[PDB]
Design a binder for this molecule. Structure first.
Ligand code: CL
Ligand code: CL
Ligand code: NA
Ligand code: NA
Length: 129
């Protein structure tokens, strides 16, 4: 499913991301924009053989099992394919573990490069939340 900007904001708000570990909702929207263009079915293969899955491009080296990332962990205890669902619950709950793991949202390269230090509130502006 390809979300609208406001629709995703609303889904993410309902799932407890709004200010989770101090990151306002705009940050999460901005990250999703640039990670996946709001498409839950986004996948991208990394140099190391790991793959990024879903709206927040969660990586199989640590966070999910795709059965093909030798030597990887599955720290969110989910199959990676669960991150591709139109229901963002699994992506959101795994994101919460990731963002709590010491690096905050710097774990998402695109957030660090495209969102961090920008006016992220722009991403939820105009939305009925
Ligand atoms: Cl694996
Ligand atoms: Cl980037
Ligand atoms: Na995801
Ligand atoms: Na894995």
């Amino acid at each position: 499913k390809v979300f609208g900007r406001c629709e995703l904001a609303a889904a993410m708000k309902r799932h407890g991301l709004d200010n989770y570990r101090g990151y306002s909702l705009g940050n999460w929207v901005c990250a999703a924009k640039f990670e996946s263009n709001f498409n839950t079915q986004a996948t991208n293969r990394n140099t190391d053989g790991s793959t990024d899955y879903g709206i927040l491009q969660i990586n199989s080296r640590w966070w999910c099992n795709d059965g093909r990332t030798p030597g990887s962990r599955n720290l969110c205890n989910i199959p990676c394919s669960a991150l591709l669902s139109s229901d963002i619950t699994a992506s959101v709950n795994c994101a919460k573990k990731i963002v709590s793991d010491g690096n905050g949202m710097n774990a998402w390269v695109a957030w660090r490069n495209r969102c961090k230090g920008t006016d992220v509130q722009a991403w939820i502006r105009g939305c009925r939340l």
